[PDB]
Symmetry: C3
C-alpha cells in the first residue's frame, strides 16, 4: 500500500526546508520487472519525500500500478500528492487518497512538477504536485513496457541534497588540435596521445550528478558540453599541465600566449530535463571567463590550476575551451607534432560543484558573473 508518514502542511513546510527544498526517492521505489505484466507495473518498496511529505511503499509485489489500456505511448510514471483529496480513517486504519502512483504526459507533469511549482508557494500555492520516477514506453497490446529511470528524482549526495558535486573526472590526457579555439572534452572521452605519431579516442572516468547536470545530446556538443539542470553559483576547479608546449628557441625564450576559459551559452532553449523552459539570466550576464591566461615558459611541461565561482542557469550549456594563436613559428602554444610528440593536455581534471543559490536579490546581485 501507498502510505503517508506524516500526512500537517506546517510540518511539511519545515521538513521541506530541512531537505534544502529538494524532493525525491530516499530508498527503493525502483521497477520490479519480475512482477510486471501486460496489465500491471510493479514497483519495489521504498521511502520518498515530496515537498516535505513522507511517502512510503510497504513482500512481492510491494505495489501494483494498473496499466490496462496503456499502449503505443511514452508516458511518465509519477508519484503525486493531491491535497484536494481526503485520507479515509477507517478502523479506529488509513487509505491515503492524497497519494497516487500514475501515468502523466510531459506537459501535465511540467505543469505540476515539484521543481517548478509548490504546495507551499508564496505567489502561486498548489494543491497538486508530482515527482516523475520513470519514462515508460508502452509497446503493442499484450507486451511489457520499456523504462528509463529518472535519476534526478532519486536521492542516492545526501547530507546537502541540493548542493555538492555536479561533475568530476579523473586525470586524463588530451591532444590539442591545431586550431585557434577548441573545447576540452569533459564528458568521458579524450583524444589520448598513444605513440610518437598518434592519438586515439579513449574513455576516462567521469561522474555527473543528474539532479545538477547532464551531457549535451547533440552530436557536435556531446563530447564537450554539459547542460545545467539547476540555477546556482557554482565552483569550477581545473588542474593539469600543457605538455610539449611550443616556444621560440633562444637565438631569450619566445613565449606563446594561451588561455583556458570556462563558458556558458543559453541561446538554445528547452535543453533542461523534460524540455523545461530555461531560466533566463539577468541582463549583462557573463558568457566567457578566463581561468588560466599566460605564456609558454620554455619548459617541456608546464602546470596550471585555477578555481573560480560562476553563476549558471537551468538550461545553460557549460563548457571549457583552450585558445591560442595559429602560427606555429610565431604565436601558437601548440607545435607541429602528433601523438606524444605533439602539444597536449596532461593529467587534466576538473570538478564542478554547486555552492550557492540565486534566489531573491542574489539573482541580480550575484547572478551576472
Amino acid at each position: 500500500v501507498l502510505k503517508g508518514i506524516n500526512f500537517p502542511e506546517n510540518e511539511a513546510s519545515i521538513l521541506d526546508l530541512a531537505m534544502q527544498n529538494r524532493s525525491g526517492v530516499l530508498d527503493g521505489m525502483t521497477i520490479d520487472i519480475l512482477n510486471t505484466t501486460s496489465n500491471q507495473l510493479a514497483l519495489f518498496h521504498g521511502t520518498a519525500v515530496l515537498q516535505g511529505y513522507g511517502i512510503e511503499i510497504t513482500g512481492a509485489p510491494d505495489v501494483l500500478v494498473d496499466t490496462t489500456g496503456q499502449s503505443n505511448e511514452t508516458m511518465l510514471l509519477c508519484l503525486t500528492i493531491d491535497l484536494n483529496q481526503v485520507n479515509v480513517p477507517s478502523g479506529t486504519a488509513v487509505d491515503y487518497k492524497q497519494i497516487r502512483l500514475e501515468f502523466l504526459d510531459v506537459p501535465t507533469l511540467l505543469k505540476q512538477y515539484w521543481r517548478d511549482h509548490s504546495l507551499h508557494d508564496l505567489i502561486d500555492p498548489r494543491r497538486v504536485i508530482s515527482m516523475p520516477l520513470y519514462w515508460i514506453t508502452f509497446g503493442q497490446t499484450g507486451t511489457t513496457p520499456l523504462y528509463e529511470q529518472i535519476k534526478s528524482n532519486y536521492i542516492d549526495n545526501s547530507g546537502n541534497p541540493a548542493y555538492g558535486i555536479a561533475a568530476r573526472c579523473e586525470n586524463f590526457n588530451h591532444f590539442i588540435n591545431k586550431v585557434a579555439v577548441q573545447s576540452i572534452p569533459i564528458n568521458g572521452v579524450a583524444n589520448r596521445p598513444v605513440s610518437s605519431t598518434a592519438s586515439q579516442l579513449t574513455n576516462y572516468k567521469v561522474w555527473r550528478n543528474p539532479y545538477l547536470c547532464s551531457q549535451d545530446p547533440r552530436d557536435k556538443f556531446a563530447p564537450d558540453n554539459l547542460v545545467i539542470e539547476e540555477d546556482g553559483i557554482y565552483r569550477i576547479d581545473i588542474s593539469g599541465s600543457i605538455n610539449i608546449a611550443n616556444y621560440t628557441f633562444p637565438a631569450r625564450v619566445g613565449g606563446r600566449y594561451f588561455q583556458i576559459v570556462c563558458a556558458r551559452n543559453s541561446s538554445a532553449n528547452n535543453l533542461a530535463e523534460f524540455g523545461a523552459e530555461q531560466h533566463l539570466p539577468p541582463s549583462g550576464v557573463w558568457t566567457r571567463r578566463v581561468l588560466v591566461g599566460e605564456y609558454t615558459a620554455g619548459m617541456t611541461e608546464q602546470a596550471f590550476s585555477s578555481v573560480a565561482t560562476i553563476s549558471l542557469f537551468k538550461g545553460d550549456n557549460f563548457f571549457l575551451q583552450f585558445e591560442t594563436g595559429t602560427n606555429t613559428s610565431r604565436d601558437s602554444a601548440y607545435n607541429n607534432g602528433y601523438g606524444t610528440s605533439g602539444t597536449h593536455l596532461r593529467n587534466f581534471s576538473y570538478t564542478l560543484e554547486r555552492v550557492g543559490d540565486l534566489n531573491g536579490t542574489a539573482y541580480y546581485d550575484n547572478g551576472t558573473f
Copy 2:
C-alpha cells in the same frame, strides 16, 4: 496580525539547530512606504525564524507599528520574542503577546541580540531575544522616517544559511603601484590599465554576503578591506596573472621575487555591525599568510592560483597584499611602465567562503591559523 507558527522550547531548539543556529527573515517583512504615515510604520507580510520560533505576518496594510512620539532619533526596528509574556487563547484564537515589533536603541538591541545571546543558551539562557530589521531615522514631527534595511538579518544562501560564499568578484585588471607593499582592491573598484600610458579607476562586479562580511567604512581602507562579521574557518581562492612582469634580460633570466598574501588585523575594535565587540582570537593567531610566492620567469604574462583555509574572527579586517622589491633594475617584479605597458594584475578574481566554525575546542586548536 503578528502570528506564531509553532509557539514548545524543545521544538524551537530543534528547528534552531536545523537552521544552523541562524535567525532571520525568510520572506517579505520589508517596509511598506505607501501605508507609512507620520504616526504609523507599515511592514509587508512575511515569515521569519527567530532562534527556532516561527513568526508570521498575515491585504494592505498587513501590519502597523505605532510611531507616535518618535522624532529626531535614529532607532532600530526589531522583531522580538519575550518568553515572559503569555499567548492569550481567546475563542476555543491566539493573540501572540510573546511576539513584538518595536523600536530599540543600539545598546538595548546589542544586550538582547540573537547573534550574541540565546533563549536556549547553556551558561546564560535568555527569555527575551531580538532581530533588527531596519535602521529608522525619525525626522521632525509630522514627517515620514528614512530607513536602511539590515540585510544581515534577511535570508535571501538558503540551504546552508550560516556558511557559503562571503565575497566574490569577476575577473578584473589592476595596475601595480611602484611601491614595496600594496593592497589589492577587492571591493569593486580597480585601477584599470586603459592605454599604453594610463590607467583609470573602473568598477568591476563584486558581491558580499552581509551576514558574513562588509566593506570597511574608513576612507583609507574602503577600496581594499573587508570587515568580518562572523567567526569561522574560511577558504580564500585567488587566481589571475601578472602581466608585463619585470625581469633582468639574459646578457640567464634574472627573476624578481614577489608574493601575494592574505592578511587579518584586529587592532581596531567595534568594526562589526552595530559596533558589536570583536571576538578576541586565540593567543599566537596568524596575521599574514603567503598565498603565492615566487620569481618572475621571463614571460610577458605569468599565471597564478592559490587556495587556503584561514581562521577569521568577528570584527577582523581581511585584505590581500602584493609585495615586491623597489629597485626596478635589480629586485622589483614591476617595471617602469604605465597603463598597459606597466606591470599589472590581469584576470584577477577571488572567492572568500565560510567553511567551518570555531566553537568549543576548535577555537584554540583550529583558530590560531
Copy 3:
C-alpha cells in the same frame, strides 16, 4: 538523571536525517574527576543525539556510573539506547530505562556501534545502539581509572556535522631528501631549513577532525600518513613553492621534471578507530593521483597549487609524495645543497575536506577515482 528529550521512532528518523546521520555529544558529558572514586565514575551534565534520539544529563555530581568490580581491564564507557526496554511513566515522571551509561569491551561496542549499525536500518534494523565516549583503564582495586576521550563522538564543525574539513595546516618549509620518492610530512612536523647548511625537525600548526581522520600510529608512517575514518568524496587543496630548485644552466634552461601526488593505500586492514573493518573500495579504484607535474623553470623559487576531488574509504591510508629524478647533473629537481641552500618546499600547506558521500550507486560510479 539520564533523561530523554523526545523518547517516536518516526520523529527520531527525521532528526537523524537532519543531523546528516551523525550521532554524538552536542554539549558537556565529559569526565568529572573531582566526583570520581574507586567505586563510581562521575560524568558532567550534557546533551547528545543518538540516531535521532535526544539524550540529556541534568549540580555536582550530575550523574554517577557504578564501577564496582571493575579492575585491571581497558573498557569503553558508552551511552546506549535499547528500544526493547520500557520508559516507566510513574507520577502523572519518567525514569528512561531505554537509555543506559555502561561499560563495554571493543567487540561488543563494534557489534552495536551507531557508525556501522542502525535502529532505522533498512536491511538489518536494530533495537540496541551505542556511542563510545571514553576509553577507561581500570587499575588495581581501590584506585581511580585513567581515561581517554573518544573525540570522534563529540560534536564541537556543527552546521554540516558529517562533512567539512578533515585536516588542514599552516604554511611550512620542508627540506627535500635526496631520493626519487618521498612523502611530504603532513602531520605537524617538518624538516625545516634553518641555516645555509642545516635543517631541523620543527613543529608547525596542524588540525585534524577526529570524526574524519587520524594520524597513522606506525613509526614509519606517523609523520606522513592519515588514516581515513569515514568513506567519501574528499577535496584535497595544496599550495606552496619549490625553492632552490635545480636546473641545467644555459651553456637554454635544462628543466628537471617533478611531481607531487596524493596517494591512498588500503593494504593494511583495521586501521580505523577501534580496529573496525575497513570499507573495501570498488574494483579498479585509484591509488595515485598527480596533483602537480611539471619541469623546473630556471627560477630560484617556483610556485604551485592544485585542487582535486578523490574518493577515500574508511580504513585507508592517505598521503602526499614528491617525486623526481636522482641524477643531480641531469634529471633531478633537487640540488646538492643542504639547509636553506638545498632544494626545499616553502610556504607549503594543504586542506583535506569531505565534500560528498559514497552511498548507493555513487560507490561504483564515483568511488573508483
